[model samples]
Target: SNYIAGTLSFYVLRNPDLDYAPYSSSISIFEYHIAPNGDIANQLNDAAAIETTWQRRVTPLATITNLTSGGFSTEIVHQVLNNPTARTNLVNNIYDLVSTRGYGGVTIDFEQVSAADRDLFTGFLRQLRDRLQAGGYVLTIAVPAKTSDNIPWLRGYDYGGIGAVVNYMFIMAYDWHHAGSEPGPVAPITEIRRTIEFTIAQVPSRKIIIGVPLYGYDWIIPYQPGTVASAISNQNAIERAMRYQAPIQYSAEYQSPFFRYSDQQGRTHEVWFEGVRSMSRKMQIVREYRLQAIGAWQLTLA
Candidate 1:
């Protein structure tokens, strides 16, 4: 059955000034051979296939650089604000393309930015807003979610500062159960509820968008240290179930569906992914919280 989903888009950014040395282990090494825009193209095609609106993710560091090092500079703030012609030209081009191509909006996904550039990013967004508004376009931003300063890493994001600038801020509520860590639900309802509670405190309820992942991982049985889990999509999860003739079970605790199976190699596997029931629960949360909308990560497989 075809669901009249409003819009589905994925995040993509160009990092021309990215220093690979600093991001050696953190970045996905397997994606080295993939095109810089591969993710973007996949996401765009996925949205088009579903007849959903597509949004192009933009970042300032993609084009601008420090004058001396030719790397990402803290001076992005100054360049974006002081250089009117450059800023206007760049933003106008973006607007023209998005508007002409039938995009629902543009989502700015600038992250790990310097604190000093916070206001500068805000200023650049304000200018983009002014230009997009002239053409009746919407602007959204992907921001880290934080409730308090318990985690220092999260303090970098100024929720109040960003919420005040864009139409809606998409709070990435997943990764609580990330790779290289103990196993758990990717987007636990308990953790997401807490994040929403805290986020609403700083940002307007109508301008808050909660993010959900449509995928999960399969960790080998008796998981050993240094071993990584395999990320499997929803369709793949169901196919795995069919292949093993595994009995499907719904997780009452996580509110997500799962199944256990043994492969021909005698290896046992557990698979979890979002089905209609799980997606309904997430939508319920969005409705319960009265959030502006729900953002799904990498909707290509969904």
Candidate 2:
């Protein structure tokens, strides 16, 4: 949407620091991942690849997921969020990592955090915020979207508290129809707006970072219970529709785009993705809400 819109100022791409080094100049921020143990994934990829000579900030994303649904362990996240020494260690280690690696900031993307650890999570962020601030670095947190603060799964994120400390708040407004659920748009505009409405109620619009999907889920037709779908990039989604000669359509309620196509084995697919049309809405949201910036799930997907 930045194409003709020309509104967005920064673009963040999720890639291995070295692999995305070529983008160090054009991209505003480069985000890699860090595990619960403080080990940066692709640790071998020296940050010297982008951090030293680059103009953009290198931000590392720390997440709780072990890479799968069954892989999420609230116990591990809670342990770190709850313990003083361990939590302190986590911040210090991340600070050391970012310091030694020359990163400008760090992003906390912890998920499956328990509701009981709400204050604990806030404390963790508070500690990290102070630590990062003392070291002259940035701290950003990714939180789940809540319409009315009534969802059970969304209880872990103490928006008002966390919102008070971080430089930016990434509201994950996507995945209404996730891999484990039925086939549908990954980010419905209504849901995204509802999330923003609830978020702006607590956090300032200038500090809010909107989550936009560059990719989407493609579930097989007649999906059954517990059936998982695979992800497809927006580009691939469009090519797939053309390749299968499928008709593309948009959902008025969701304010998103989707289509259906069949494979050689006669298996049908219901694909939903963000196109220029839908992505345009993202620009409108950013402008409408006067948000800080837009955080795409990944950059290469575009």
Candidate 3:
């Protein structure tokens, strides 16, 4: 039999529908988070439902975040990464979660990490990796996309250091444009190519997993500083274009598709999103870079 064996790793919520099957190579469930006291919290998601649903198909990886009461707290990450006792406790907690739940592995998705704790974060991952490797489980991390180390907000992730300690690095190559920003492509190929090129120089190409967005943003014309765009799925974006009689336009430079239309209020809106053509270009980069996997933000949205 002829077949293509590669990771189309997709992040999923609890009780995900079976529609994502056949193509989804790995399922990253979202997620558990670190508590204010450095303990892992289980109050948010349903573990029983997640386990029962995903156990039947592919064993899923549990993703852990640093989200707290205020929102991905920088203080919580600083506490866990700086304290040796906290790291040990956190590592043991992660091991217990994987072993007890029969998870395939665990993913560190701690966002808004302090740039000052870069080395400490690497040390934390190394300790966690040692424990997970000993237990025969994979350790992965989802990192923000960057072409260089100068991006101040993204400096917490030391590509070369972190890549050495984890099994796979899911580079979130999307979100170049976001809800609060002006209308633009969510995952432009020009920037993604540069991100990949920069990452490969630090980490092995095979260990890198390129991430593509399954959604886009619809922004009203004359965007204001505080205005927010509505998030829409790729499938729904097309339907909206057809419903409004707005022909989809493609940007050969960005390798993304967009369309503009007015709603019942007669207010103009612009939409930019990923489609077959847009995503295909992403796949081309994956092939060109010899990356072993491609990931979607989530199955529910796409």
Candidate 4:
């Protein structure tokens, strides 16, 4: 079978930026977001990104999210899912956005949703699928990666229930080691393999889309209990390594790249990020599973 690829890009209202430099026809789907309240309000509203995506022969997928200025609001998602009237409004809002705009469909990216609203959240997607289906549009969702069903932090996502409704399930397979966590490979190959194995057992392999991180974290050395790392793009990670004249090292076990470097100020750092080698291994997972395709977390960062 042939391989298909897709990637996410941000729609910054203020800057209204769309990086089309890396556009390729093989990138079948191009996804961007519409902020909270079901509309692309407040932020720089530019429909040109959608048009440009189509111009390059890519399917535009609108990502509907519950993100506000403060961050992803759990209350906002809980209210939207639990309240019937509010839920209906959100569904209609999504329908309106898709129907009016030249979008192929939408991906519900309501992060940090309460576990109490698990079934209700799936119900919302079912409703949305029904609406979008009537209009010949597709539906998908971004779910946190989990190797099991009993994960407390990720219990809100009912993978089986969700898999049944949406056209595709985008497994956020990265961030095993994040900014807040200890220094390690951003996405260890072994963890991603286990995550895919667990998910495919619940969700059909044909409907699964694995997520790849286009960025990595640079953490300070001598790890503190509560220190955060600075986020850097894959390219910048390499640049920093070269700048410090630090030779990058590869971890065969993790299937990721890393290195250590010291700044002029005498502070040390440990960096772990994905490079071509790691990404190639990730693609092997895609082919081994014979899954749908790979979706990059965000294109702008890459």
Candidate 5:
């Protein structure tokens, strides 16, 4: 089935420190790990109601390294794909879930994996694809966007190898404007275009899924390393405009909406989030490029 759709989060990690909101009415697939004595039957039973009712795709997202600047834990990293019993259990559970629940597919979201494990990770995925495919299940891998060889942080991902292994690849194309950097459009058109051009060269367009951010950041002016910013949703962005009595503006080039307002402390702020217009334009690109699909990162915000 060839279908293009948006993901909605029913439950998500909610905290002032996190960028998104808590569980709403939608079903959420929170991250889970394989413990030493992990019981797949119990886990499936606990998740059955939500998994069956909402029927949102169950994607067991896994983290490779702590993205907040820590190296991989040697033991944990081994447990993911190297440990004998753990690896067998994980693969068995994934296959059983896919066969039993009719899951949309398996989405592997291992990020910041060690460079040494790049080939190992690819091999692990190939093994997964073999097992899942035997049961007629689809496999998708999340990959980082590559602008140039200089995007040092994500160089560990071997896109060509991964694309060869999975049925689809989801490229995370956001974070153009991070907390420590100069402010700019979160996913600029120029940057996305470049990423697409590069990605298509390595991965088939039909197997590529572009990942887009559903929210935006409000960085304080004269940004500093330790300084933090507030994250706003598309709905609250308009509400924020009304609260501050500021006019919202649209960017023709980036095709996103933004508004500038001053806080009670007289601090200036800028907000940028996707509007209907921008969403339509992005959909148009999907048609023009004939992309397989689009992946929304934080479904709660959407």
Candidate 6:
């Protein structure tokens, strides 16, 4: 590992349900996104080939909210979130997708969930787990990084019940600052550690996979109130900092890197990214907490 990538126990290919495979077949595990309509939006053509190449631990991630293409469908999520039969049908579809396709697991990743759907969502997980577990399948869920469960937005995920059912829970530890927010580190150490501390209290660290960011964001300055920043990779981020001769400064408090530069138009800009060192810090946390595995927002720099 020239870049000193940490030892990752599990590797989840970002795009699931797609025939296109990885450069290396050794990475057996992949997360395929499942649409709310009970259809596999992105899937694999040959699970046998992948398992023959990789392993049986591949998990098809069921997400009503597909981040890469269509934004999370509120309507689709609502149909299942509010309707009991819809939830059952969705679960059955997932079982069919996994069992026939020869997958070892499933990941429930419904985001932008409503607080009212708390019990409903957990019930869905319980049903899926029982059915899947009968067949020796693993179940996992992706949860937002939150300090407390009392927040209105965080209410949808009931950690105790969630942790009780799934084999592992992937706590999305990144996104301290998002696209809609002002320029700042994607995952700050202090905030992340604090979030981890909160999460571990509810879910066992051993069953939690700390989610990490492999990318960064560039915000054009003068502080536009609402416009989003463009996403960039950590490597390219450094190159841009170097190109402008912007001195990189790692916030000891945040344990993240940031710099300032100007475009050719002389428009000021701010960049916050994770360098190799910063990513290493995350690995240290995973080891310290003894989490299950590391989950990435995406596998490679796009």
Return the TM-score for candidate 5, rounded to 2 decimals: 0.75
lDDT of 2: 0.69
Tell me each candidate's TM-score: 0.64, 0.81, 0.87, 0.86, 0.75, 0.82
The true-versus-predicted C-alpha distance at residue 219 of model 6, in Å, is 0.8
Worst 10 residues of 5 by lDDT: 10-19
Clashes of 3: 0
Top candidate by TM-score: 3
lDDT for residue 230 in candidate 3, whole number 0-100: 92
**Each candidate structure's count of clashing pairs:** 0, 0, 0, 1, 1, 5
Worst 10-residue lDDT window, candidate 4: 10-19
lDDT of 1 by residue, 26-64 (tens): 000000011111111112222243233222222111111
**Model 2 per-residue lDDT tens digits across residues 1-302:** 34332211133432222234422212223334334554444443434443532444444433323233366566767667666777787778778866887666666767888888888889888888899899887777767777875677788888888899887787777878878888887888888888888888898877777777745888999997877888878888888888899998998888899998889999988988888888788768777877766667433211
lDDT of 4 at 103: 78
Q: Could you give candidate 4's per-residue lDDT for residues 175-238 as a string of tens digits?
A: 8888999899988999999998888888888787787885699999989887889999999999
Clashing residue pairs, backbone N/CA/C < 3 A, model 5: 10-26
RMSD (Cα, Å) for all candidates, in order, is 11.8, 7.5, 7.3, 7.8, 9.0, 7.3
Report residue 169 deviation for candidate 4 (angstroms).
1.0
Q: For model 6, how does the per-residue alpha-carbon lDDT over 159-251 read when each residue is reduced to its tens digit? A: 888988887787787777877888888999998888888878887776777777856999998779868898888889989998899999889
lDDT of 3 by residue, 203-260 (tens): 9876788877856999998888988999998988998999999999999999999999
Query: Model 3 segments beyond 4 Å from truth?
Result: 1-24, 43-57, 297-302
lDDT of each: 0.58, 0.69, 0.82, 0.76, 0.62, 0.71
State model 1's lDDT. Answer: 0.58
lDDT (C-alpha) at residue 28 in model 2: 27
Model 2: worst 10 consecutive residues (lDDT sum)? 7-16
Winning candidate number (lDDT): 3
